[PDB]
Design an enzyme around this catalytic site. Structure first.
Site, short mmCIF file in Angstrom:
data_model
loop_
_atom_site.label_atom_id
_atom_site.label_comp_id
_atom_site.label_asym_id
_atom_site.label_seq_id
_atom_site.Cartn_x
_atom_site.Cartn_y
_atom_site.Cartn_z
CE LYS A 82 -0.92 -8.48 -4.93
NZ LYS A 82 -2.21 -7.73 -5.14
CD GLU A 124 -3.31 -1.71 -4.20
OE1 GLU A 124 -2.94 -2.66 -4.95
OE2 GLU A 124 -2.85 -1.55 -3.06
CD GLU A 172 -4.66 -8.71 -2.09
OE1 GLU A 172 -5.53 -7.80 -1.94
OE2 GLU A 172 -3.44 -8.53 -2.20
CG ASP A 210 -9.77 -1.51 -1.13
OD1 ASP A 210 -10.62 -0.80 -0.51
OD2 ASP A 210 -8.82 -2.12 -0.59
CE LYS A 230 1.71 -5.90 -1.17
NZ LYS A 230 0.90 -6.15 -2.40
CD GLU A 233 -1.60 -5.35 -7.38
OE1 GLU A 233 -1.82 -4.76 -6.27
OE2 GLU A 233 -1.69 -6.60 -7.52
O1 LIG Z 1 -1.95 -5.33 -3.43
N1 LIG Z 1 -2.18 -4.78 -2.34
N2 LIG Z 1 -1.36 -3.80 -1.87
O2 LIG Z 1 -0.64 -3.20 -2.79
C1 LIG Z 1 -1.27 -3.47 -0.44
C2 LIG Z 1 -2.02 -4.13 0.53
C3 LIG Z 1 -1.92 -3.85 1.92
C4 LIG Z 1 -1.05 -2.89 2.40
C5 LIG Z 1 -0.29 -2.23 1.45
C6 LIG Z 1 -0.40 -2.50 0.07
MG LIG Z 2 -1.18 -3.84 -4.70
#
Ligand SMILES: O=NN(O)c1ccccc1
Ligand SMILES: [Mg+2]
Ligand SMILES: O=NN(O)c1ccccc1
Ligand SMILES: O=NN(O)c1ccccc1
Ligand SMILES: O=NN(O)c1ccccc1
Ligand SMILES: O=NN(O)c1ccccc1
Ligand SMILES: [Mg+2]
Ligand SMILES: [Mg+2]
Ligand SMILES: [Mg+2]
Ligand SMILES: [Mg+2]
EC number: 5.1.2.2
Lengths: 357, 357, 357, 357, 357
Positions: free
Chosen positions: E162, E245, E315, E268, E164, E219
Site C-alpha cells: 500500500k 481504521e 496490514e 484497527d 499513501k 482507502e
Molecule cells: O492505513 N493506515 N494509516 O492510514 C496510518 C497508519 C499509521 C500512521 C498514520 C496513518
Molecule cells: Mg489508512
C-alpha cells in the site's frame, strides 16, 4: 345554459397507405368510432376514438350509444360531465373501453365548446396557437421501406421520424436504424418503439446497443403496465425511456412518474381522458420535469400541445385522414393549427360511406 | 386434442329481491352475460360476467361475440389461451371490459376442462373440497332493512354479514352498525363497505369511529385505484382495510400490495382474470401475508377459495341465482361445493327466457 | 376420493459421464432418492430428489420413510397435502431436507394426478405442450474439455451451454470463456456459474470483466442466501445476475426479488416446493418481471416451464438418465415433452439394482 | 494439537411430565439426539439436538452419523470446524436439518474445548459466571393447568412464566392470561407465545387485546419466516414482538432485524448454529439494540447468556432433564452455572437406556 | 477465579526506519503506550496502544494509570471487564482516548487469558492458526522511494503493497502508482490510501482516474466520520472503497456499513475495542458481506484475522518492532502466528530504555 341534445356514432374501418406493423402484431386498417355531439346552441361537436383492433370496434360503438341517455340534457360543461361519468362508472371500472368512450365524449364536448365561442380550442384553453415540431411516425417496415419512408419524411421537411422495432434479432434492429441514419444524416431524430415486446433484461441489452447507435428515445421497451420494469430499464440508460400512450387516465400517468418509469411521456388524447384528462396530465409532466409529447390524435394534439408547459413533440400518424378534411398542415416539419373554431375537424361525409362497418 | 368449437353468449337483466344500494349508486338488477363454450369433447363450459349496469351490458356481450374468432379452434388450455389473449390485446389495453371478457372465457374454459376430466374444479386444481365460511352480503339498506336482513342471515346459520355504508352522515353509518350488532350479538362478523365514497380524511375519520364500534373490516373506503390513499387510510387504523374487487388482473393486485394499500384482499373472479388470474392472485396474497376472500361469483369462488392458501371468507351475494340451479349450498354458514364436474353451474333454461334482453 | 395408499423410496448413487466440478467442490456421482407414491386408483406417482452429497442421502431417504405414515390415507390432492405438511413441520422448520422431502412427495403426487386423468402434467396445469429452449449444462471443466463439450453440444443443435467458473484466477475464467467463444461463434449463449464462490467485491471485478467478454448471465456470484449482496453485484452490471436454484420455497424467492437480488431466476423443482411451489414461483416471476428458467429436474421442468408465463430456459443436466427412460427428447436444442400421462418418468428397473445404496 | 477422534450419537424419545401443547400441534415427548465428541485429549464433548417430532428423529441421527466422516481427525477448533461445514454444505443448503446437525457438533466441540482447558464454557468465552434470570416455560395448558403451573413457578422463586396461547377464541387467550395474573400478581412477567398460529390481521387484533391485559411479550404471532409480517404486527404494538427460536443461523437473524421484525430476540442455541452462531447473534443483537433471550438448551444457554451483551431472559423448559444430571440450579428464579468444565452436562447413563429408540 | 492484580504502562516514542508521511501530515516516530497487566495466576498480559502524535501520548498513559484502580481485583474476564468499562465511562463518553485505553486493557487481558491456558490466542478463540496474506504498508514516499520500497517488498515475497497518496496534483498520484506498477508487474496488488484528504467531488475525480490505473482499493478518500460521503464516492466506483481504521468501537463500524459507506473494511485492533470489539466487528463484516482486513497491530491481528470469517488482508506496518521480539514472521508474504501462548508479544526490555518519554 347550453345543453347536450344528442349523440351519434359511426364505426368505420379505414384503409392505411402503410399498415402499422409492430413487434406484437399488425394494425392494417384503422378501426374508428366517429362521434357527433349535438347541442342546443345548434353546433355539433366532433371527435373520434381509435379501437386498435376491429374485434373491439362494435363493442365501443355500442357502449357510446348506450351512454347517450346519461349525457343528453346535461350541460355542455366537459369538466362537470367528466366527473359525472367517473361517478356513474365508479362500480363498473372507469378504465379501458369505458374510459375511452368517456374521453370520446369529452373531446367532442370541448370541440362543441370552442364552436359555441367561435374560437379555436387552443385559445379557449387560454394559450396562443404556435407551430409544434412533429415527427413522422412509421412502423416495423424492414430496412428497405423504413429507409425510404425516412428519406421522404426528410424531403417533406420533418426533422425526425419514429420507426417501430423489435425484429427477431437485435442485429436487425440495428441494421434498420443504421440504414435510416446513413440516409438522413446526423442532424435528425430517429425515435424507436419496441411496443412492449421485450422483457426487462432483453430491453436493457437491446437498449444499450441502440443507445450506442444514437436514437432519440426508446419507447415502451416492456409490458406497458409494468412501471417498475420500465424504471429498471431506465436505470441502465442515458437515452430516455418514453411511454404513456397506454396510460388510462392521468392517475396511471401519476403512478408511472411517481416511481420513475420514464424520462419522457406521450399521453394519448383518448386514453388519457380527452382534453380534460390531457390538461391534468400536462400539470403532472410539468411538476415531474417530464417533456410531454402526443400519441396519435394529431388533429386535437396540435391544440393540446400548444397549451402544454413541457410540450415536446407531436406524433404524425394520420389515422383519420380518409374521413377528416386536411385542415391541419405541416410547414417545415411543424404542425400548424388551423384557424377554425373548436378542433378544426370536418368530416369528409362523401368518404365515410366507403368504410362503414 | 380437446378444442374449443363454439362460443355462445346470452345477455340477461335479472331483477333482484334486494337491489344492491351503494353510497355511489344502486344496482337494481343484475345485468349478466351468460357464457357457453362448446368443445370437441362435447361437454360445454359455463360461466357468466356481471356488467354492473345495463349501460355496459350490450357492449360486453358484443365484445365477447367478436372475441369468439380468436378462441374457436384453439385447444382448451385455459393458461395458454390467457397468454394468447394478453398478446392479442397488447396494443388496445388488456384491461377493463376486454379483460372481463377474457376472464369469462377463462372461467368457462376451466369449467369445460373439469368436465373433460369428470372432476369438480377444486380437485383439478389439486385441492380437496372443504366447507368455506361465508358472509351474507347485503347493501345500503337503511337501519330497518339491514337489521332485518342480518337477523335472517343469523337464522340461516351465517356467522357474518356485510353491509354497505356511506350515508350522508357518519351518525347514520354508526346507527346501522349498532342496530345490526344488537340483533346478532358480539360473537358475529359485521363487515362494512364504503364503495369508494370517501376522500382520505373523511375515510380516516369515519373509519376510526367504526373501529370503536367493532367492525370486521372496512372495504374500499376511497377511490378504488388510489392505492397510496388506501395505504394512508390503513396507516391510521387497527381494523383491517379490505379491497380488491376492482383489481383488473393480478398485476393490479401486485401494485396495491407492494405499497401496503390494505391488510385484506378480495379479488373478483371476473376482474382478477378468472381461474387463471385467481390462482396467480392467491400466490401473491400468500407471499404478502394477506388473507384473501372472494367477491361475487360465489359458484366458482367456493372452488377457488378451497385452493387458496390464505383463504378467508366467501362472499355470498347470489346475483345469478335466478338463472343457475342451486347446487352450491350453505351448512352452518359454510359454502359446500357440489359433487359435480367443473364448477357445478347448471343453467335454469326455463328461467333464462324471462330475462333475455 | 382418490387416496394415497403408500410411499416407497430407494436411495441410489448414480454415475455421471461427466462429474459436476464447481469452484466449491465436486459432485462426481448423483445421490438420488427415487419416490413411488401408491394410490387407491391403482396408479403410481414417481419423482426423485437430488441430495447433492452422499452425506445427506440416507438421512433424506429415512425422513421420507418416516413421513409415510402422515400421508397414507390422505387424499391425492397435492395442494391440500402441501398445506398439511407445512403445518405438520411448522415447529421443526419447514425448510431444508424436510422441505425437499415434502417437494418429492408433491412431485410424485402431481405425477399421480396426471395419471389418474390420463393426461400429461402440462395439460393438467391448463397449458399446451410446446418445445422449450434448453442449454447444455457443463461444469468447471478446464479449457480443453470445456471447449469440446461446447462443440459437441452445438453439434447436437443446442443454442447455448453453461460452464461453471471460479478458477483460482480471473484470467483462467476468461481463457475458458474465450476458448468456448472462438469454437461456437458469436450467435450462441455462454452462461457462466460461480457457485457462490466469490465475495461481493471479487464478484463485481470478475463479473465486469466477464461482461466485457459477452456472457449470457452470471449465476450465483456470491453466497446463495445473501440477497443484499447479490443486489450489490447486480447494481454494478448490465448483464443479468441469475440465481434461484437454492431458494427453499417461493417465500425465499419472494424475499430475493423484493430487494432486487437478480434480474433472472431459475427455481429448482425440488427446492422451490415441487409443482405446487413452482406454480407459486411462476406467479411471482411474472409480477416481478423476471424471466424464469429451471434448475435440474429436466423431466418435470419441461412441463412446468410450458405453464410458466415468463419461461426462459430449461437447464439440461441429465442427473437421473441412468435410472429413468429417455422419453424426454431434444429437437434442435428444445426439450420436447413426451405424450405420456403425468410427468413421463418411467424407471429403468433393470438398472436401479446397480446403484442401490 | 487436539483432534476429534470420534462421534457417537444416541436417539432418545423422552416422555415429558407436561407435554408441550401449542396452537399448531403438541410435542408429547422430547425426541433428542445425544452427542459425544471424543478427542485426542481424552475428554469427551457432550451436546444434544431437539428434533421436535419423532418423524425427524432417525433422519437427524443418521445425518450426524454420516457427518462424522467430515469431522473425525479435524482439529478441535469449533470456529474453523464451522467454516469447513458451511463449505461442505455450500451446494446442498446449509440450513435446516443439516445446519442443526452442524450446531450439535459445535456445541459438543465447545464443551470439549472447555474440558481441554479445565474451565467452564462461560470463562473460555471471556466472561464471568453470574446468575441469569429465568422464566418458567409452560404451554397451551388450559386455564386450570396454566394457573396451577404458574403458582408452582412463583413458589419456586421464578419471577416470570411463559404460556402458549392461540386458542380457538381470543376470549380464551385472555381468560388464561387473566387467571395467571390473578394468581401471580402485578409484579411478575407473563410472556405469551402464539407459535405462528395467526395471520397478520388476527395477530394485530389479538395482540392489541393482550397488550391491554398486560403481558411481557408476544412471541411468534405469525409464520416464522415472515419477517415483513412480524414488522407489520410490531408496527401496531407497544408491547414487544419476540421471535428468533426459528432462525437458522445468524444470517436469518440479520435479515429479520434489518427490516425491524421484532423488538426482542431469542435465538435457539441449536438453530442459531451452536456457540459459534450464538456469539455472532449476540454481536448483532447488541448493534441493533435488541435484548436477547434464549430458547431451550438451558444448560448451554446459561453460559451463553452470561457472555451476551444484551442478555435478557433464559428460557427454562427442561427437555433433557430426564437424561442430564441437574448440575444447573435455580436460586431466586436465576440460573446458576455449575463450576464444571465446559457446559457442565453429565449424562444420566442409567436413565438413557430406558428411552433409546 | 483468576484476578487482575495490577496495571503498569510505559510511554515510548520509537524511531521509524521510514517515517509515515500522509497527505494530512507526518508520523515520524511511533508514540506507544506499553501495557503490562498483572494477574493472580502469575502471568502478565501485554499489549500496546498507538497514540499517533506525541501530543496525545502522556494523556493516554495518564488515563490508563488512573484506570488501574477500577480494574485491580476484577476477574480476568475481558468480556465482563469491557462491559464494566462501558458502564463506568457511560457519562464521560466511551469513545476516543478513553475507548482506546479500554481496548489496551482488553488486548492485554486476552493475552493474559491465553497465557493462563497456555494456548495461542487464535486457539483460545476456537480457530486454527493459518498463514494470513499480508501487504507491505508504505507511505507518501515520492516516486523514487515508493518504487524502491515496492521492489524490496516484492523481493521479500509480498504479493501487494500500500502506498499513501494525496499529492498536490492528481498527475503525481498517478505517476507514483504507474511507477510502482512498471516495477512490480500486473500480478501484484497496489492499495492506495488518501488519508481523508479529499472532499467528495475531488475523491470521485481522483478515484475514477486511479481505478483506470488498476489499484486494489481506495482507502479513506474523505473525512473518516463522513460515512454518507464515503457512500457517495463508493457509488461512483467499481473498485472498492476501503475504511475502518478510525471506527471507534463496532457501533461505528455498524453505522458505516448500514448506509453502505464502503465495500471493504479494516478495523484497527485498538480503535475497534481490542479482541472483544474485533470479534463483534467480524460478526458484522460477515453479515454485511464485507471482506475484513486489519490496520496496524500486526502481532495481534495475525491471530484475530485467523478467527475472522471474511478475513481479507493483514496490514504489515511494524510500528512496535523496536520494542517487541520478532516472533511474528513472514513466509511468502503471509504472516505466520508464532507458537507462543496468548499473543506472542515479548518485550525487548533492553531496548525500551532508549525510548522512554
Ligand atoms: O492505513 N493506515 N494509516 O492510514 C496510518 C497508519 C499509521 C500512521 C498514520 C496513518
Ligand atoms: Mg489508512
Ligand atoms: O406509438 N404508437 N404506437 O405504438 C401505435 C400506434 C398505432 C397503432 C399501434 C401502435
Ligand atoms: O362488495 N361488493 N360490492 O362492493 C358490490 C357488489 C355489487 C355491485 C356493486 C358493488
Ligand atoms: O447450476 N446448477 N448447479 O449450480 C449445480 C448442479 C448440480 C450439482 C451442483 C451444482
Ligand atoms: O418457545 N418455545 N417454543 O415455542 C417451543 C418449545 C418446544 C416445542 C415447540 C415450540
Ligand atoms: Mg408507441
Ligand atoms: Mg365491495
Ligand atoms: Mg448453478
Ligand atoms: Mg416459542
Amino acid at each position: 345554459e347550453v345543453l347536450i341534445t344528442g349523440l351519434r356514432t359511426r364505426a368505420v374501418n379505414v384503409p392505411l397507405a402503410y399498415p402499422v406493423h409492430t413487434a406484437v402484431g399488425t394494425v392494417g386498417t384503422a378501426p374508428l368510432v366517429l362521434i357527433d355531439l349535438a347541442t342546443s346552441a345548434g353546433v355539433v361537436g366532433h371527435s373520434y376514438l381509435f379501437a386498435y383492433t376491429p374485434v373491439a370496434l362494435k363493442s365501443l360503438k355500442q357502449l357510446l350509444d348506450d351512454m347517450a341517455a346519461m349525457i343528453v340534457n346535461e350541460p355542455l360543461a366537459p369538466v362537470s360531465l367528466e366527473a359525472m361519468l367517473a361517478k356513474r362508472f365508479c362500480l363498473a371500472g372507469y378504465t379501458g373501453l369505458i374510459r375511452m368512450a368517456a374521453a370520446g365524449i369529452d373531446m367532442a364536448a370541448w370541440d362543441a365548446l370552442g364552436k359555441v365561442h367561435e374560437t379555436p380550442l387552443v385559445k379557449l384553453l387560454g394559450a396562443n396557437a404556435r407551430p409544434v415540431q412533429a415527427y413522422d411516425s412509421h412502423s416495423l417496415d424492414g430496412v428497405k421501406l423504413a429507409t425510404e419512408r425516412a428519406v421522404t419524411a426528410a424531403e417533406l421537411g420533418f426533422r425526425a421520424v419514429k420507426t417501430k422495432i423489435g425484429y427477431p434479432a437485435l442485429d436487425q434492429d440495428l441494421a434498420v436504424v443504421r440504414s435510416i441514419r446513413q440516409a438522413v444524416g446526423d442532424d435528425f431524430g430517429i425515435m424507436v418503439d419496441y411496443n412492449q415486446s421485450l422483457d426487462v433484461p432483453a430491453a436493457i441489452k437491446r437498449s444499450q446497443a441502440l443507445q450506442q447507435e444514437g436514437v432519440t428515445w426508446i419507447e415502451e421497451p416492456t409490458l406497458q403496465h409494468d412501471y417498475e420494469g420500465h424504471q429498471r430499464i431506465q436505470s441502465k440508460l442515458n437515452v430516455p425511456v418514453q411511454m404513456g400512450e397506454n396510460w388510462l387516465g392521468p392517475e396511471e400517468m401519476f403512478k408511472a412518474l411517481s416511481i420513475g418509469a420514464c424520462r419522457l411521456a406521450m399521453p394519448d388524447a383518448m386514453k388519457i381522458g380527452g382534453v380534460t384528462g390531457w390538461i391534468r396530465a400536462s400539470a403532472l409532466a410539468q411538476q415531474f420535469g417530464i417533456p410531454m409529447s402526443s400519441h396519435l390524435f394529431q388533429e386535437i394534439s396540435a391544440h393540446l400541445l400548444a397549451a402544454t408547459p413541457t410540450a415536446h413533440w407531436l406524433e404524425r400518424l394520420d389515422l383519420a385522414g380518409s374521413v377528416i378534411e386536411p385542415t391541419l398542415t405541416f410547414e417545415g416539419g411543424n404542425a400548424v393549427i388551423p384557424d377554425l373554431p373548436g378542433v378544426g375537424i370536418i368530416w369528409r361525409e362523401k368518404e365515410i360511406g366507403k368504410y362503414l362497418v
